[PDB]
Write an enzyme that holds these catalytic residues in place. Structure first.
Site, PDB file in Angstrom:
ATOM      1  N   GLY A  72       0.833  -1.198   0.000  1.00 22.41           N
ATOM      2  CA  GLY A  72       0.000   0.000   0.000  1.00 22.41           C
ATOM      3  C   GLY A  72       0.870   1.251   0.000  1.00 22.41           C
ATOM      4  O   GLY A  72       0.456   2.323  -0.472  1.00 22.41           O
ATOM      5  N   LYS A  74      -3.875  -3.564  14.145  1.00 23.34           N
ATOM      6  CA  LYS A  74      -3.458  -3.329  12.740  1.00 23.34           C
ATOM      7  C   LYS A  74      -3.669  -1.930  12.166  1.00 23.34           C
ATOM      8  O   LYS A  74      -4.816  -1.513  11.910  1.00 23.34           O
ATOM      9  CB  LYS A  74      -4.060  -4.351  11.773  1.00 23.34           C
ATOM     10  N   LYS A  98       5.132 -10.907   6.686  1.00 28.81           N
ATOM     11  CA  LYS A  98       5.696 -11.149   5.366  1.00 28.81           C
ATOM     12  C   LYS A  98       6.367 -12.515   5.381  1.00 28.81           C
ATOM     13  O   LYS A  98       5.862 -13.482   4.799  1.00 28.81           O
ATOM     14  CB  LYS A  98       6.706 -10.040   5.002  1.00 28.81           C
ATOM     15  N   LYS A 113      -2.737  -8.253   4.241  1.00 29.40           N
ATOM     16  CA  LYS A 113      -2.501  -8.476   2.800  1.00 29.40           C
ATOM     17  C   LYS A 113      -1.662  -9.714   2.508  1.00 29.40           C
ATOM     18  O   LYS A 113      -1.923 -10.463   1.563  1.00 29.40           O
ATOM     19  CB  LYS A 113      -1.816  -7.250   2.206  1.00 29.40           C
TER      20      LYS A 113
END
Lengths: 298, 285
Positions: free
Chosen positions: A12, A130, A260, A202
Site C-alpha cells: 500500500g 493493525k 511477510k 494483505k
C-alpha cells in the site's frame, strides 16, 4: 497457456507513501510505475495474479464516512473495504491496460471484488492491532514509531470466496487483480456470509490465495529488499532453505518484515514452491534466480 | 453451458421516500437477488448490471467533507467506490441464495470502465441527477466496454457476472492512455451497449413498473406488451416517453443492432417476461 502462475503482493506504500499527499493523481502516478514493473513479468510469459494492500485507502474512506451527517449514513468498515477495492482496483486495472496498450498488446485484465472468510470468534476482534489510515500524533490510535496510526481488528484469513473464478480467469490467461486489502472481511455462519468490521493482513490473504490456486510462485513485493540485522555483524537473506528461517524467524528477528516472512514460510511449507520477498523494482529479476529473499523447498 | 445468455440491468429500488443506511440497502438487494436466482436455475447465463445515482451521489457527498485530513476524490473515483460497494452488495446477495439452494458455486463482480467521447454535449450540459432533489452531473454516451473480452469469457465458462454497475467508470482514451472523466453514464444505454457487444440473446431492464404505458392515467391508456421494432422507435419518435425514456432508448438500439428481444419489466416478473407471460417484450420486424 504455458506460463507458470505467480501470485504477487503489492504494498500500500506503493501508491500512497507515508509522507505523500493521498491525492488521486499522486496515487495513480505511483501505480503507473508499478503497472510497468508488473508488465515485465507478463512480458516474460508468466501468469499474474495481482493483489495489494489497503492501509492508506480503507483508512481514508472510513475517516470520511465518520464525517457522518453531511446528510450521509456511515458505512461499516467492511463496506469501506468494499469501497477501497472498487478504488485501487480501478487504478490498477486502468494502469495495467495503459501499459498493455502502450505495448501494442491490446489485451485483457479484470478486477474482481473479493470476500475473505474469517472466524468471528477470532481474537483480533477484541484486540485491534493493525495500522490503518494516515500518520500523525496523537478504537485507539497507535505508535508504529513513524507516526500514530489508527488500528482495527486484524483476524486470520481462511477462505477466498471467489477463488473459483480467479482460477478460471487464470486458466484462460487473464491477468487478474483481486483480494485487494486481502478481501472484504466476512464470516459464513449458517449458510449465510455477512461482513465483520476488520482489515485482514494483505500478506496472509495473499499467502492463503497462493496455496488455494496452487501457484508456482508467491512473490510479495515491497520497497525494502530482504531483511537484515542494521548492526556491524549483519546478514540479510538470499536463497535460503525452509529449515534456516523457520528457525531464524523464531529467534524473534522479524516489525514490518514479520508477517511477510510468516506468509512466505506458510506457502513454501505447504506447496514445496519458492516464495520471494523483494523490492518491487527487482521483481522480474528474482524470478530468474538472481536476487531477493527466495525461500525454498528444502 | 447450454444456457442462452440474458443481460439484465437492475433498477434503483434494487437497493432502495426511503434512504439509505447500509442495512437498508442490503435487504433490498437480498430481495432482487432471490429474483435473479430464479432465472439462473431456469438455465440462462446471466449478466447483471445496475445503477450508481444514490450510491455514487452519496459517496460523492462524503468527499465534499473535503478536509478531515482526508482529500476529496474526483467524481469518476467515487465512481469506482460505487462499484466496490454495489458489486459487493449483489455479489454477497447471490452467493447466499446460491448456498441456500444448495447450489454452491460461482459469481463475481468485475470493476468496469466505460469509454466516452470527450467531446459529448453532456460534458457541457449536466442533465442526470445524482445525489427538490438533484445534484446533477454530466451523462455522456458509452462507446466501448473496456473489460468486454474478459466478461465475454467469464460467461463462456458460465460464471454469474456483475459489471457495469453505475454503467462503469466514465473514461476517455486518447493516445492509447485510458483515463477518468468526471461524469456518470446512463445505466441502461451502457448495459445495452454491453449486451449487443457480448451479442447476448436478450437484454432486459427491470424497473419497478411491471410494464410501460402510453399516456399515463388516461385510457386512451395503453400499457405496452409485445411490440415490433417498427412500431416503437416510431412511438418514441413522437414523444410518448419524455423517466421511461432511456429505458426505451436502450432496448430499441439493441433489438435494432442484434435483431433480439428486449424486455422492460418489474424485477418481480423477469422470469415470466423471459417466458412471454408479460413485460414489454419488444421484437424485430
Amino acid at each position: 497457456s504455458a506460463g507458470k502462475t505467480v501470485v504477487i503482493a503489492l504494498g500500500g506504500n506503493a501508491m500512497l507513501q507515508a509522507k505523500e499527499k493521498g491525492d488521486y493523481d499522486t496515487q495513480r502516478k505511483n501505480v503507473e510505475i508499478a503497472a510497468s514493473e508488473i508488465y515485465k513479468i507478463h512480458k516474460a510469459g508468466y501468469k499474474v495474479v495481482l493483489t495489494s494492500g489497503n492501509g492508506p485507502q480503507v483508512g481514508a474512506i472510513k475517516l470520511q464516512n465518520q464525517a457522518a451527517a453531511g446528510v450521509s449514513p456511515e458505512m461499516p468498515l467492511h463496506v469501506c473495504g468494499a469501497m477501497s477495492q472498487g478504488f485501487i482496483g480501478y487504478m490498477m486495472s486502468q494502469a495495467m491496460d495503459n501499459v498493455f496498450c502502450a505495448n501494442n498488446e491490446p489485451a485483457n485484465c479484470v478486477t474482481c471484488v473479493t470476500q475473505t472468510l474469517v472466524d468471528p470468534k477470532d481474537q483480533a476482534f477484541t484486540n485491534p492491532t493493525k495500522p490503518v489510515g494516515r500518520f500523525y500524533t496523537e478504537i485507539l490510535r497507535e505508535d508504529a514509531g513513524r507516526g500514530w496510526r489508527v488500528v482495527v481488528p486484524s483476524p486470520r484469513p481462511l477462505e477466498i470466496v471467489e477463488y473459483g473464478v480467479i482460477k478460471t480467469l487464470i486458466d484462460n490467461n487473464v491477468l487478474v487483480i483481486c483480494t485487494n486489502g486481502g478481501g472484504i472481511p466476512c464470516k459464513r455462519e449458517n449458510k449465510v456470509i455477512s461482513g465483520v468490521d476488520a482489515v485482514i493482513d494483505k500478506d496472509l490473504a495473499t499467502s492463503l490465495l497462493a496455496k488455494t490456486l496452487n501457484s508456482d510462485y508467491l512473490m510479495i513485493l515491497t520497497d525494502v529488499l530482504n531483511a537484515c540485522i542494521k548492526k556491524p555483524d549483519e546478514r540479510k537473506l538470499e536463497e535460503i532453505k525452509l529449515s534456516e528461517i523457520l528457525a531464524l524467524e523464531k529467534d524473534g528477528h522479524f516489525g514490518s518484515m514479520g508477517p511477510k516472512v510468516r506468509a512466505a514460510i506458510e506457502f513454501t511449507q505447504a506447496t514445496g514452491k519458492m516464495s520471494i520477498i523483494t523490492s518491487l523494482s527487482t521483481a522480474v529479476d528474482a524470478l530468474n534466480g538472481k536476487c531477493g529473499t527466495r525461500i525454498i523447498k528444502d
